[PDB]
Amino acid sequence: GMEMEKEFEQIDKSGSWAAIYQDIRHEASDFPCRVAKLPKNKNRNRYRDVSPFDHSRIKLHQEDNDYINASLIKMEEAQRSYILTQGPLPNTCGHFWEMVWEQKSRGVVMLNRVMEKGSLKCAQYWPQKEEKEMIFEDTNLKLTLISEDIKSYYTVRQLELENLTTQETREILHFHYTTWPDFGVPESPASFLNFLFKVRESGSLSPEHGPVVVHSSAGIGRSGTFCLADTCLLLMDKRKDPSSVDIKKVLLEMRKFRMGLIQTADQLRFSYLAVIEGAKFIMGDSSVQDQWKELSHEDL
């Protein structure tokens, strides 16, 4: 089969995933995060050990404090960008939506739940009920739930974001994967790819929009897995050449822009599985998309 498939089988046969993953960690970029570590920003960071590099951090367009824990992953060869961010805190939900507005994002991909393992891993940063809209007074934004489509393991929401200064409104699509555990993997390649293709189908990743926002709790593990698989499939798609993609090199390129992307060796292995499976679609087996939808059990 494909070259990534041959490397996959070699690594599985030798039981080498931990060593492969540790090599990536060792080779990964190390750039300063001075702004993230300023005293005044301590309460804007969810995790002490997860910070945006200065070079790639998203700046808020405000004079007071322009800091958010968010990074622009700009994949030059693939011609796709993503914004990866932590799950917003109770005091940074206004900042989060400010960033969405200013960066002209059409979609937000949320890969975590608000409560995981008994702890609050993300703030409730969007409205749960149509009739209870949210106002972010610090950033002068209003957010309303317009509709939601609840599936067995993910939910898609239509939100309306309004800049109260100008009264301009935009439709934001929210893609919420609700069964992906932290430091874990999706139930199957099919369930993951079914969801990724839902995001793709929406047009949220179009170059006509700002970068999609992808987040988890830390904005690196589940978020890294999602973007690695998406970028690798896009690279193969541009060239129509699966054997042209080097998944580990792509991950190291991504890690130039945000630290710590992909948090376990099993998330790396899963990324391979997802790309190998998705290649079937890229190379012209259109019917596999329906198979994923069936295998994902999304209706239940």
Contacting positions for Mg ion (CB under 5 A):
216-218, 221-222
Among 20, 35, 114, 295, binds Cl ion (CB under 5 A): 114
Phi/psi of residue 3, each to 5°?
Answer: -70, -40
Q: Output the smallest distance, CB 215 to Mg ion, in A.
A: 9
Cβ proximity to Cl ion, 25 vs 239, nearer residue: 25
Cβ proximity to Cl ion, 162 vs 258, nearer residue: 258
- Out of Mg ion, Cl ion, none, what residue 25 binds, judged by CB under 5 to 8 A for its kind, is Cl ion
CB 261 within 8 A of CB 228: yes
Q: Output the smallest distance, CB 298 to Cl ion, in A.
A: 17
Q: How many residues does the chain have?
A: 300
- Out of Mg ion, Cl ion, none, what residue 46 binds, judged by CB under 5 to 8 A for its kind, is none
For the chain, the distance separating the N- and C-terminal CA atoms, rounded to the nearest angstrom, is 34
- Out of Cl ion, Mg ion, none, what residue 218 binds, judged by CB under 5 to 8 A for its kind, is Mg ion
Q: Output the smallest distance, CB 259 to Mg ion, in A.
A: 12
DSSP-H helix ranges across the chain: 3-14, 17-27, 93-103, 189-201, 221-239, 247-254, 265-282, 288-296
Q: Output the smallest distance, CB 56 to Cl ion, in A.
A: 16
Q: Which of 117, 85, 99, 107 is nearest to 217 (CA)?
A: 85
164 belongs to the binding site for Cl ion (CB under 5 A) = no
Cβ proximity to Cl ion, 115 vs 164, nearer residue: 115
What is the H or E stretch that residue 73 is in? Answer: strand 67-75
Size of the site for Cl ion (CB under 5 A): 10
Among 107, 224, 260, 278, binds Cl ion (CB under 5 A): 260
> What residues does 123 pair with on adjacent strands?
none
Q: Output the smallest distance, CB 98 to Mg ion, in A.
A: 22
39 belongs to the binding site for Cl ion (CB under 5 A) = yes
Q: Which residues contact 128 (CB under 8 A, 6 or more apart)?
A: 145
Describe the crossing of helices 247-254 and 265-282 by its angle, rounded to 10 degrees.
Answer: 120
Gap between the Cα atoms of 190 and 140, Å rounded: 40
211 belongs to the binding site for Cl ion (CB under 5 A) = no
Which residues contact Cl ion (rule: CB under 5 A)? 25, 38-40, 113-114, 118, 120, 123, 260
